[PDB]
Design a protein around this ligand. Structure first.
Ligand SMILES: O=C(N[C@@H](CCCCNC(=O)c1c(O)cccc1F)c1ncc(-c2ccc3ccccc3c2)[nH]1)c1cncs1
Ligand SMILES: [Ca+2]
Ligand SMILES: [Ca+2]
Ligand SMILES: [Zn+2]
Length: 368
């Protein structure tokens, strides 16, 4: 039936700024929050302001040296850290900005807090749109990500769940999460992403895990222009097979919105309905579920996507006509919630989609 939803947000998150021209805009989280508030979605969920995750909480995954670096570096002292900046990949993509550490603490706090709430059986779903920073590694920032809130949240879920399923619908391969759990069967990672001359370069169909983790990493490589139809040919059949074989007791779903049509950095052609159908499919299994954010660079579409996915989590129908809100002008010229796909060519033929699905089904037959 209808599920209980806990939503994590800190009103300060929208004030963090990556710098002039940087495509990552934390303000998109504030736009999402304001839109879902104006739709009245606050009357149906418990809203929490997560704590600032401590350096000690972050070192459950990250190295002590890397976390100490993040907690020490500032724009005014950067010149003294040129050596560590190179070592930790802090530079162009992952710049030093005012409040960087606090931004990491809030993004991480929401994911860990949601995982604790699910562990305590006090909610069916927990949502942290400021999380989903799948590219961060043990001792390295990457792809606009510094602290891997997902890995930390999964480590929290593993305290009470034998098997945790991680699903990632961001356009980019979920590399940091896949690497963290590559040699264990206690987490299955499933990533659907653009593959081929594309960041971060990993996520080949043939990357299936190693040691005890062999067959517990699943990668669905895609070409430009995937549409709702192509994604629909494979998402439910693959997730259904994974649920059947793996039988997880908790699920983490990364909902990166850079897989939407019209994204500034992405090259996919999903609509908000197509992207949200993934949330509907996963939610249907009725398992404890942590929903996280991720990429997304056409910020009016990110706000639409995550507002609609919050309504999907709540089983709440909302009108296509947008309510008035603090960012109303960003949603012109139509002022509607849903988006139309572009005319871009879908390079993922129906035959290619079925063929990759069949190769993944062969690997899933290898689970015990
Ligand atoms: O291609 C490389 N970088 C990629 C990284 C894209 C990472 C995407 N991350 C997410 O989508 C993501 C996610 O999936 C989940 C959670 C959070 C996330 F952020 C890149 N695309 C564009 C730029 C860009 C453009 C303009 C700039 C202007 C000012 C300063 C820096 C700018 C950076 N950077 C390379 C690096 N080193 C060698 S090649
Ligand atoms: Ca992905
Ligand atoms: Ca694994
Ligand atoms: Zn991304």
């Amino acid at each position: 039936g209808k599920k209980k939803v806990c939503y994590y947000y800190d009103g300060d998150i929208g004030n963090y700024y990556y710098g002039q021209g940087h495509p990552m805009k934390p303000h998109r989280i504030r736009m999402t929050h304001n839109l879902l508030l104006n739709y009245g979605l606050y009357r149906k969920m418990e809203i929490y302001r997560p704590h600032k995750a401590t350096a000690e909480e972050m070192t459950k995954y990250h190295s002590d040296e890397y976390i100490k670096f993040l907690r020490s570096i500032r724009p005014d002292n950067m010149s003294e850290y040129s050596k560590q900046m190179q070592r930790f990949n802090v530079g162009e993509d992952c710049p030093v900005f005012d409040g960087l550490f606090e931004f990491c603490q809030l993004s991480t706090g929401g994911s860990v807090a949601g995982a604790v709430k699910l562990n305590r059986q006090q909610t069916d779903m927990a949502v942290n749109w400021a999380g989903g920073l799948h590219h961060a590694k043990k001792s390295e920032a990457s792809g606009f990500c510094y602290v891997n809130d997902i890995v930390l949240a999964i480590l929290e879920l593993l305290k009470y769940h034998q098997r945790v399923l991680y699903i990632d619908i961001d356009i980019h391969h979920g590399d940091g999460v896949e690497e963290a759990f590559y040699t264990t069967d206690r987490v299955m990672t499933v990533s659907f992403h653009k593959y081929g001359e594309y960041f971060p370069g990993t996520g080949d169909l043939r990357d299936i895990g190693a040691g005890k983790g062999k067959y517990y990493a699943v990668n669905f490589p895609m070409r430009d222009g995937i549409d709702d139809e192509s994604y629909g040919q494979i998402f439910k059949p693959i997730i259904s097979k994974v649920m059947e074989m793996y039988q997880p007791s908790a699920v983490v779903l990364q909902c990166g919105a850079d897989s939407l049509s019209g994204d500034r950095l992405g090259c996919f052609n999903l609509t908000v309905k197509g992207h949200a159908k993934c949330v509907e499919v996963v939610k249907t299994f009725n398992l404890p579920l942590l929903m996280l954010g991720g990429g997304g660079y056409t910020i009016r579409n990110v706000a639409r996507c995550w507002t609609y996915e919050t309504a999907v989590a709540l089983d709440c129908e909302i009108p296509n006509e947008l309510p008035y809100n603090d960012y109303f002008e960003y949603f012109g010229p139509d002022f509607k919630l849903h988006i139309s796909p572009s005319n871009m060519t879908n390079q993922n033929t129906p035959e290619y989609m079925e063929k990759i699905k069949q190769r993944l089904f062969e690997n899933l037959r290898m689970l015990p």
